[PDB]
Amino acid sequence: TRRETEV
Amino acid sequence: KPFFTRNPSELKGKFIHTKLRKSSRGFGFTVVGGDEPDEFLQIKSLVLDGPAALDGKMETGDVIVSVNDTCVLGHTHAQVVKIFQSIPIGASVDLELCRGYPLGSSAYGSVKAYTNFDAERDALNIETAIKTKGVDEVTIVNILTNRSNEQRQDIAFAYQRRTKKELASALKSALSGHLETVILGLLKTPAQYDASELKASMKGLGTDEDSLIEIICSRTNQELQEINRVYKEMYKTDLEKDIISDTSGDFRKLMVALAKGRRAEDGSVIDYELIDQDARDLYDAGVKRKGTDVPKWISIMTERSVPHLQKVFDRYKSYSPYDMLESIRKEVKGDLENAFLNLVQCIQNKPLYFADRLYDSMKGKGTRDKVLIRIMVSRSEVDMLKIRSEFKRKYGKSLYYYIQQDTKGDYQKALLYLCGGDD
Ligand SMILES: [Ca+2]
Ligand SMILES: [Ca+2]
Ligand SMILES: [Ca+2]
Ligand SMILES: [Ca+2]
Numbered sequence: 001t002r003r004e005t006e007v
Numbered sequence: 008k009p010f011f012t013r014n015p016s017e018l019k020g021k022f023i024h025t026k027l028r029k030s031s032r033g034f035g036f037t038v039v040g041g042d043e044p045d046e047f048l049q050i051k052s053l054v055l056d057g058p059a060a061l062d063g064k065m066e067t068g069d070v071i072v073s074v075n076d077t078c079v080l081g082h083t084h085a086q087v088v089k090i091f092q093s094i095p096i097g098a099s100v101d102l103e104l105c106r107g108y109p110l111g112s113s114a115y116g117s118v119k120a121y122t123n124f125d126a127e128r129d130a131l132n133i134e135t136a137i138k139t140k141g142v143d144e145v146t147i148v149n150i151l152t153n154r155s156n157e158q159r160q161d162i163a164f165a166y167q168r169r170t171k172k173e174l175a176s177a178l179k180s181a182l183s184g185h186l187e188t189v190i191l192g193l194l195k196t197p198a199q200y201d202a203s204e205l206k207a208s209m210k211g212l213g214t215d216e217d218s219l220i221e222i223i224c225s226r227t228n229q230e231l232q233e234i235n236r237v238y239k240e241m242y243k244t245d246l247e248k249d250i251i252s253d254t255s256g257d258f259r260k261l262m263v264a265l266a267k268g269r270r271a272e273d274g275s276v277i278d279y280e281l282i283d284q285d286a287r288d289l290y291d292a293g294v295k296r297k298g299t300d301v302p303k304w305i306s307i308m309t310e311r312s313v314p315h316l317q318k319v320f321d322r323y324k325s326y327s328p329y330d331m332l333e334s335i336r337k338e339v340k341g342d343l344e345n346a347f348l349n350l351v352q353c354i355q356n357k358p359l360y361f362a363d364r365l366y367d368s369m370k371g372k373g374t375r376d377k378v379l380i381r382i383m384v385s386r387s388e389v390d391m392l393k394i395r396s397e398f399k400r401k402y403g404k405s406l407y408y409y410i411q412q413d414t415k416g417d418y419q420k421a422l423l424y425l426c427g428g429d430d
Contacts (some may be wrong), residue, residue, distance in 0.1 A: 003042050004051055005088045007034050 010108060011045035013081035015072050019122055020107015022072065025064040028099040034091060035059045038071070039110070041084025047071075048079060048087055049110045065102070068110040073103035109155075117391035117427035120155035126165035129154070133162070134170060137181045144186060144417045147178070151193050152424035156388060159194060185376050185418040189425075192384040197230065202238040204381060205246065209253040216342050218377065219250075221364065223265045224349040225357060231268025257301040258342040264309040265350070273312040285311065286322040289334075294327050299338040308350055316354050358393035359401075361386055365394070366402055369413040379410075383425045395430050405429040 012018065027034050035057020040048040050069040053060040071079050071087065079087050094100055107122045129150050136143035151159055163174040170177070175194050182190055192200050201222050208215035208222075226234065238246040250262050285307050292300035308316060320331040327334055335347045352360035361382050368375035368382075386394060398406040407429035410422050 002039060003084050005038050005084065007036055007038050007088060007091045 009045075009047075011047055013078075015078065015080060015105075018070075018072070018105050018107070020070070020105045021123070023064050023069075023104045023106060025059070025062055025102050025104065026099055027058045027062060027102065029091075029094050029096055030058050031096060032057070034100070035061075036065060038084070038088060038091075041082070041087070045081075047108060048082070048084065049108075050104070051110070065104060066106065068108070069104040069106050070108050071102060072105050073101075075101050113389055115390045115392045116388040117395070118152065118155065118387045118425060120158055121153060124154075124158055124161075126158075126161040127169070129162050130165040130169055130174075133166065133174070133178075137177050142181045144182065145420075147182075147190065148186075148417055148421045148424065151190060152421055156193070156196060160196065163194060184416075185380065185414075186416070186421060188376070188380050189384065189418065189421045192380060196237075197385065197388075198233040198237040199241070200385060201226065201230070201234050202241055202246075205234070205238065206242055206249065209249050214253045216345065218381070219253075219262065220342075220346045220349045221378070221381070223262055224346065225353045225360070226268070228268045228270050228272070231266060235266070235268065254342075256343070257305070257339075258346060260302070261305050261309070261343065261346050261350075264305055269310075271310055271312045271315075273314050277318070278315065279318075281311075282315065282318045282322050285315075285319045286326055289319070289323055289331070290326040293334055293338040294329065301339065301343065304347070308347070308354075313354050320351065320355060356397065358390050359397040361390075361394045362398040362401065362406070365398065365406060366409070369409050374413050376414075379414075379422070383410075383422050387425045391425070391427060395426065399430040 032054075035054035036059040037051035037054075038048055039051035040046045048071045050065055050067050050071070052067055053065060055061075059065045073079060074087060074090050077090075079090075091100070106124075109120050112120070133147055133150060136146040139146075151162070154162065166172075166174040166177075175191060178190050178194070179187065195203060204218055205222055208218040223231075235246050238244075242249075246266055247263055250266060251259060254262050288303055289307060292303040307319070311319065323331050323334075329337065331351050332348060335344055335351065339347060349360070352363070364378060365382055368378040382394075383391075395406050402409075407423060407426045410419065410426060414422055
């Protein structure tokens with residue numbers, strides 16, 4: 001829902 | 008409007024520098040932020056057994072200040088993630104991180120995380136107070152009450168590293184009275200503190216039904232799901248088992264249903280038809296016919312989302328001469344009634360519900376310290392600012408004022424620090 005990115 | 012800036016000289020936290028080389032599965036952490044025009048890009052989580060976590064310098068809530076000698080204060084989310092993804096395997100990235108601005112913080116709590124946090128510094132100063140001849144409770148109260156719970160957990164770990172003795176055991180021997188109760192409660196996590204109180208309410212063959220009703224009726228799905236896991240790890244027994252062992256009848260059914268924490272999450276769109284039907288069922292099961300259909304009340308009041316039930320109770324006034332609270336007092340009595348009344352209060356206005364419980368614990372002779380301590384500890388990082396607002400709006404004076412006149416000593420000081428001043 002909240003903009004999240006696996007880095 | 009959270010704090011934001013794009014000049015590193017205007018940041019208040021502490022600065023750390025790490026140098027991570029990308030592995031096969033990336034750098035091993037999650038980035039959040041960069042949605043609203045002024046959102047800081049923060050470390051959402053770590054991936055243990057990964058490059059960032061095994062370095063140990065990176066922690067959650069950190070803010071990315073610079074990536075490989077290029078400032079990212081103000082860059083959008085897609086810009087900083089393409090930087091990390093353009094890196095090849097084996098290449099190293101230099102991250103500048105700021106620690107002081109938090110994430111996942113409720114804007115309605117009264118005790119905020121310390122900006123210039125230092126776990127080893129507070130652990131040393133507390134050790135001093137414990138061995139001080141006389142116990143500097145002042146120091147211990149000034150420190151712990153001005154730290155967040157997660158910060159207090161780091162104090163206990165730092166205290167265990169430098170003393171080989173747990174902070175909970177050391178503070179349990181040097182403190183006494185209600186002050187000992189408050190500090191030991193602040194040292195526990197929200198899940199650990201609630202799980203301990205629940206077991207305490209069921210100790211012996213009797214039951215402290217009030218403490219059980221308060222915690223079960225006021226906790227959300229996420230909080231209850233974590234309590235069930237922690238309670239099973241602490242006492243080797245599922246919480247539902249000890250509830251069945253200390254409750255019976257429809258009261259047992261309601262507490263078991265609520266404790267499951269499987270209430271439906273709030274839906275995106277409002278179901279006006281189900282709002283009307285749930286109100287009809289609550290009226291047809293209670294006031295309309297003689298007797299009471301308690302299972303139908305338990306089903307609706309436990310399974311439906313909180314915003315839905317708020318509109319249900321308002322639509323209930325269209326069918327019934329009495330509102331939901333007055334309907335409960337007439338239809339049911341005893342433990343089942345007290346649990347239903349507590350549940351409806353938590354749905355309609357939970358901060359108001361805790362305000363009344365605080366006033367009830369102090370209005371008469373003496374003080375129900377068990378209820379007063381639990382609320383001031385569990386709601387300190389949740390909705391303490393809202394409870395203080397509803398309190399002064401209803402009772403004229405401030406909650407700080409009532410705690411002042413009903414508690415004394417350092418025990419008063421500790422509770423006043425958790426309040427946050429007089430409104
Ligand atoms: Ca003691
Ligand atoms: Ca009836
Ligand atoms: Ca009193
Ligand atoms: Ca008392």
